[PDB]
Structures are given as C-alpha cells and as structure tokens.
Amino acid sequence: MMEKLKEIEKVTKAIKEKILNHYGYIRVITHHDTDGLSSGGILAKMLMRTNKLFHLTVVEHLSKEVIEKLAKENEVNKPLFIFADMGSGQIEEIIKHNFNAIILDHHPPVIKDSFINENIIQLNPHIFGVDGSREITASGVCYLVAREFGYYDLSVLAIVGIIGDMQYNPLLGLNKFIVNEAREYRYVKIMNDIVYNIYDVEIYKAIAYCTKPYIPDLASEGKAFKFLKDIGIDPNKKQLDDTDKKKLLSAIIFKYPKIENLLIDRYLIEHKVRDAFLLSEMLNAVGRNGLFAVGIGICLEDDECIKIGNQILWEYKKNLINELKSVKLKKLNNIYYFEGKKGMIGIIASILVDDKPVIGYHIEGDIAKFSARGNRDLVNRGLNLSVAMAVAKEFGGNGGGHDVASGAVVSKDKVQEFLKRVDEIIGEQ
Ligand SMILES: [Mn+2]
Ligand SMILES: [Mn+2]
C-alpha cells in the first residue's frame, strides 16, 4: 500500500497555498503531447475555478534557448510559473534565473528535493519512489494538485494523459488510484468492448483506419465495407451490439487470429468526447499538427475545437494507413525489416508486429538508426531485443534497451551484415 500518497499530499497542500496566495500573472508551460495538453486543460480549469487569470504556452522542448526567453519576461513583474510535463530535468537553469516556479513532472529528477529554496516547489513522484515510466503521468501529477481544491471531475483529463503516455496496460500504482477515484466519484465507467466502438464513426471507417490492431486485408473503406456486408452488419452502424461483436469476431479470426487484441477495457468519461481513447488520439493529432490552442479547447469542451479535432484525427489516420501500405517489408528467417522515413520507423515497426519481430531503419548521413519491436507473446517465447540490438558493438556501433522496444546505430555500410547478425541472435526461439 501507498503511504507514498500521504508524502505526496504534503507537497500538494503547499502548491495549493502557493497558488491561492499568488495575486500576480500566472504562466503555464506545458508540452504538445496528450499528457501535455491534458495537463494544460486540468491546470486551465483548476486556475479559472480559483479565480486566477493565466497565460498558457505550449513548447516542443524546454531548451536553454527557451528558458532564457521565458527568463527575459521575469524582470517585468515576476509571474508564478507552472511547468507541466517538464522542468525536473532543466531545474538547475530554473533555480539560476530565480523563477517563482512550480514543476509538475514525472521525468527522472535531477534534484531529489520537493522544496528547493523559498518560491520553488517540485512535485515529481520519483522523489517518493513512484516511477513516471509506469505508475504516474503529468496529467496525474496535475490532478493530484486539483484534488486539494476538491476538483475530482478533472480526473477525466488525468485518465486521458494515462492513455496518452501508454500507462494503461497495465494500470499500476497512482494511475490505478486515480482511475478508481474517478470511478468512485462517477466520472468514468470502465467496460470491456471491441476496439472498433472507441471511434463513434461508421464501423467500416473504424475498421479501415484502425492500427490497434492493423489488419492489412481490411485497411480500406471498401474491404471493411465488403467484410461487414458479407456477414450481415449494417456497415454505417456507429456501435456494434453483442450480436454484431459475435458475428465480427467469429469471421475476423480467419484474417486476424489473435482475437484478444480486438477486445479492450474502454474508459467512458464525463466529457463531450465520451471515450478517453478517442480523446487521447484527437489530442495527439492536433498536437502533432501544432494546433495547441485547439487542443486546450478540446479539453475545455469547445464544440468547434472538437469538430476541428475530429477532422484532424481522421486526416492523421488516413495518412498513417497510406504510410503503412507503402512500407517495403523484407523477410529474413526470424525477422521482418524495412527502410523508412526519419521519425516514423518506431511507430510503424510496433503497428506491423504480428508473428515475428520488426526492425525499421533510416539512413541519415554516415549512420543507420534501427528501431526493433515485438509483443508479449514474443518475450514469453524468449525474446529480448536489448541483447539482440547490442550486437551493434560487433560493427563499431551501439545497441538499445528493453525486451520489446530497442534501437541501434551502425555505419550505413554495415546494415545488411548487422541485420543478418540480429536475425541469427533470434535463435532464442
Ligand atoms: Mn509525459
Ligand atoms: Mn511528454
């Protein structure tokens, strides 16, 4: 059990008092990812209810350049700064420039102290042994502050961040605590359901652009429409009922045998976007596109911001199916590999995993960047991609971490030799 929360609650009561007693400008810096926008929304709602006007800025990276610019505004009547999914790692520069500052972070800390001089407070649950890799997100840290004011309804946005940062399989620690609070206070219903019911669009559209999972023989409106018609589902239906689910699963198992991946615990939230999965996806797509303020408007439930969000999400999903259909996969005994576009190799690699591991790579300058990916059924059968990718050391290179995700870097001239060798090291099956 978590007496770690009692230790958390000491810092939250202080953050509350620091906000309640601050009568000047308040300045909120947050990130463009789902965890950042969610954090933005929770913070926005918390501060409006506490009668604080504030200026919200969304930032890609919190670099030295950006701290300096933020700092040039700290001479002119110094605002309280609230850093969201960031600040713990750049704290030395924040202390230097003498910001009146609150850091709400879950990235690994540089200073394992909550109270850093008068007028800096860092809430980073690593300091209490939580783990921002698996048990808490920024949305969640921001929610832990919101609770001190009695704003349990902001838990809905906390859950969006949990899904954003991929900390919902499995749901551990504080994240588990937050979801249970949201359920206790009636702001989320959790129910097992087929993945296609997340999108509240026509089922054939839900199936065609779905990448969780990506079933390639169904990845176009035509094929998905044919497939649904041939087994008696109204393809323009927006929710599959229990009878439809059976007909769908019964038939799809021939094209996609791992039925269990089509069934998901759905978070149904008290938010105009009724599905936390859908909201997470929407927020990520407006963030990818630099529509940060629209992002904040989706969190605040603006009808037009949501219409924009829906349009951008479905554009994003079409482009992603187009990029997947264009990958030239190459078989190699134990492994598929592909050459791909800078920034895309990892996300593509994880979507293309069925039976065997998948290594994507980009050739930039003198160097080849690999991203190797697998699944739980692959680690259970003996797979660790960390040891596989480490074989880069044999080619003058370096090789990455984790049993499913891992990367590597090798000279462009040694690609075919490296992949050959990573393939052999998957004798561990
Ligand atoms: Mn994050
Ligand atoms: Mn982030």
Side-chain angles (χ1 to χ4, degrees), residues 1-5 8 11-12 14-63 66-67 70-71 73-74 76 79-91 94-117 119-132 135-188 190-211 213-257 259-273 275-287 289-317 319-322 324 326-329 332-341 343-353 355-365 367-368 370-375 378-392 394-402 404-413 415-429:
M1 54 81 100
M2 301 175 304
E3 61 190 42
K4 318 204 190 219
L5 197 57
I8 294 311
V11 185
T12 63
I15 284 168
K16 177 184 175 170
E17 295 326 300
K18 185 166 204 245
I19 293 168
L20 277 184
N21 300 331
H22 184 77
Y23 285 112
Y25 295 135
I26 294 190
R27 188 102 170 74
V28 171
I29 323 294
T30 193
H31 204 230
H32 66 313
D33 61 2
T34 303
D35 189 36
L37 297 187
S38 297
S39 286
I42 289 167
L43 251 12
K45 295 185 109 133
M46 194 188 90
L47 291 174
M48 289 187 316
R49 295 160 178 204
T50 286
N51 189 29
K52 307 286 176 178
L53 302 158
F54 62 87
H55 179 199
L56 197 154
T57 289
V58 168
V59 145
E60 313 257 277
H61 328 248
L62 187 68
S63 62
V66 178
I67 302 266
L70 258 31
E73 101 173 67
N74 209 43
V76 306
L80 178 43
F81 278 85
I82 307 189
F83 296 95
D85 156 57
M86 74 194 42
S88 276
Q90 309 91 340
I91 192 154
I94 288 170
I95 299 163
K96 175 157 81 83
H97 287 284
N98 202 226
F99 284 73
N100 187 26
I102 297 161
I103 322 283
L104 307 179
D105 205 350
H106 70 123
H107 294 230
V110 158
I111 304 197
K112 278 88 176 164
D113 225 313
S114 300
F115 300 102
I116 304 168
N117 64 53
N119 69 206
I120 288 197
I121 306 187
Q122 177 180 42
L123 179 50
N124 186 332
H126 268 267
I127 287 154
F128 304 95
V130 164
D131 190 350
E135 289 178 27
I136 193 75
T137 50
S139 53
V141 179
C142 301
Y143 174 65
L144 293 178
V145 179
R147 302 179 72 233
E148 279 300 317
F149 300 98
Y151 304 158
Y152 305 112
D153 68 315
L154 303 189
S155 58
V156 155
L157 285 180
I159 294 171
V160 171
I162 295 168
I163 293 162
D165 273 355
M166 303 245 58
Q167 301 194 2
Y168 70 97
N169 248 326
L171 193 63
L172 311 166
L174 286 185
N175 289 335
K176 202 159 71 86
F177 170 83
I178 288 170
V179 169
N180 177 78
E181 194 155 78
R183 189 174 55 205
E184 177 185 335
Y185 281 86
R186 246 83 230 298
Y187 296 113
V188 61
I190 312 163
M191 70 161 289
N192 203 77
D193 198 349
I194 191 171
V195 64
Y196 302 128
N197 281 345
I198 276 158
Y199 303 91
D200 200 51
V201 303
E202 292 94 340
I203 296 305
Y204 72 93
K205 295 201 204 148
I207 304 182
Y209 305 110
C210 186
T211 71
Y214 177 58
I215 296 145
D217 285 316
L218 286 190
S220 71
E221 302 198 5
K223 296 173 195 193
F225 191 101
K226 269 202 65 220
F227 177 75
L228 279 164
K229 151 232 284 155
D230 287 326
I231 75 198
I233 325 273
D234 186 353
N236 295 117
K237 214 139 88 320
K238 279 182 144 63
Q239 293 288 95
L240 297 165
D241 70 19
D242 288 335
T243 298
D244 295 318
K245 279 177 231 198
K246 295 166 170 160
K247 291 200 257 108
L248 179 41
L249 292 176
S250 182
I252 202 153
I253 196 159
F254 294 112
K255 307 200 169 284
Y256 190 80
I259 273 344
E260 62 261 61
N261 293 349
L262 297 176
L263 290 160
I264 194 108
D265 285 335
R266 267 181 83 193
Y267 298 83
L268 295 166
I269 52 177
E270 284 296 306
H271 194 282
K272 286 200 190 160
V273 178
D275 201 309
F277 279 95
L278 181 52
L279 194 36
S280 180
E281 270 204 59
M282 201 171 299
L283 252 40
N284 216 269
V286 312
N289 285 238
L291 304 180
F292 308 152
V294 179
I296 300 296
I298 297 155
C299 298
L300 295 182
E301 278 171 290
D302 186 82
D303 279 332
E304 189 60 25
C305 285
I306 293 170
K307 192 210 189 108
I308 293 165
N310 235 270
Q311 176 210 122
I312 291 290
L313 171 61
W314 289 107
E315 267 187 52
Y316 171 78
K317 277 182 155 305
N319 304 324
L320 189 50
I321 298 300
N322 296 338
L324 286 162
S326 83
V327 307
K328 307 284 168 143
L329 272 191
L332 200 74
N333 288 355
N334 312 293
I335 247 141
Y336 298 113
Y337 74 96
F338 69 100
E339 163 157 37
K341 309 167 156 82
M344 285 263 86
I345 60 172
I347 11 192
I348 292 280
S350 9
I351 290 159
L352 286 178
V353 193
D355 46 314
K356 318 185 155 171
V358 178
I359 334 293
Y361 69 94
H362 179 85
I363 299 222
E364 189 159 6
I367 233 182
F370 292 81
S371 298
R373 300 285 124 119
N375 44 43
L378 243 27
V379 310
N380 288 356
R381 294 159 47 201
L383 203 227
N384 132 58
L385 255 346
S386 211
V387 173
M389 293 308 260
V391 90
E394 308 192 355
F395 299 86
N398 314 242
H402 288 320
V404 279
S406 82
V409 176
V410 169
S411 106
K412 75 153 171 275
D413 294 282
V415 168
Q416 226 48 57
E417 310 41 73
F418 174 63
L419 276 168
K420 197 256 180 61
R421 185 94 188 86
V422 179
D423 182 57
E424 296 169 22
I425 299 199
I426 322 248
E428 71 197 51
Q429 327 255 60

